[PDB]
């Protein structure tokens, strides 16, 4: 049944709750972003109101075929009334179209639901600075001190320098980047830009990217693989067997593959810096795992929460085990005692 951490008290609302059938008492279903564990259950047969960003609404219409009459897109950073309740959508710094949602309950309680987010100091100057938040529904994906990772900027700088050097040494090297969802577009776009190429991809992935309101996108992507030297493939294909196979398909246009796998976290983050990352190599194929994250590090999470000073925290990730729940509750108490709220 629908878990309590997906329900907004004092309202008829649910967040990211599309796989339980009809939730009794739900008058409006919000969707924070277009990732499959969050939209799981939506289709052209859905007949309840869905509230979301413009970009998420484009993907619902074009990829899932939800009918336009049930899609209610809202602008960001704007006070809106939904079924009698004031709400605001804020940028979550996750994937394209991802939002956090501020609910202003009739009784005076203010609730923030982060959806999935990568906390950032710039959030401390949004509409969040303007009033107190009592309850926080928090993306706790990486809520443990082992989880450090570099800035997105540092990671993109590494990828751009690595690719440019490789291709300039060998003009017959192909660059491949893995994907299985929206998000992390900066990785393949930044590499293609430094190489003066468009990125080539499947028709299904091209359709997906044309939903994202990315400026000048027609100048940056293409379905013509032959004219491109940065290819996107399914993340499943980013291994030696899949890459050797792909190389055969290019008809001797290329003699070397340099591939990127933008993982979340991996245990080499506890030891190694970004400047010191190395690939796995077999023959003329090299695979780089790069720690490009669209979720908060532990320290980024902690700074946001200690700034916001909520009265109550409700985790939305890692909630399935008692040992995980208890560990998270210990960190929350540490943070509150350190900061004095
Ligand atoms: Ni997500």
Curated annotation (Swiss-Prot):
Query: Which GO terms are recorded in the biological process aspect for this UniProt protein?
Result: cell division; double-strand break repair via nonhomologous end joining; interstrand cross-link repair
**What GO cellular-component annotations does this UniProt entry give?**
fibrillar center; nucleoplasm
Tell me where in or outside the cell this protein is found: Nucleus
Q: Predominant location of this chain?
A: nucleus
Induction notes from the record: During mitosis. The mRNA encoding this protein contains an internal ribosome entry site (IRES) in its 5'-UTR. This 5'-UTR generally suppresses translation while specifically promoting expression during mitosis, when cap-dependent translation may be impaired.
- GO-annotated molecular function: 5'-3' DNA exonuclease activity; beta-lactamase activity; damaged DNA binding; zinc ion binding
Tissue specificity is: Expressed in brain, heart, kidney, liver, pancreas, placenta and skeletal muscle.
UniProt keyword terms in alphabetical order: Cell cycle, Cell division, DNA damage, DNA repair, Hydrolase, Isopeptide bond, Metal-binding, Mitosis, Nucleus, Phosphoprotein, Ubl conjugation, Zinc, Zinc-finger
Which family is it part of? Belongs to the DNA repair metallo-beta-lactamase (DRMBL) family.
Summarize subunit and interaction data from the UniProt record for this chain.
Binds constitutively to TP53BP1. Binds CDC27, which is itself a component of the anaphase promoting complex (APC). Binds PIAS1.
Q: What does this protein do?
A: May be required for DNA interstrand cross-link repair. Also required for checkpoint mediated cell cycle arrest in early prophase in response to mitotic spindle poisons. Possesses beta-lactamase activity, catalyzing the hydrolysis of penicillin G and nitrocefin. Exhibits no activity towards other beta-lactam antibiotic classes including cephalosporins (cefotaxime) and carbapenems (imipenem).
Name recorded for this polypeptide? DNA cross-link repair 1A protein
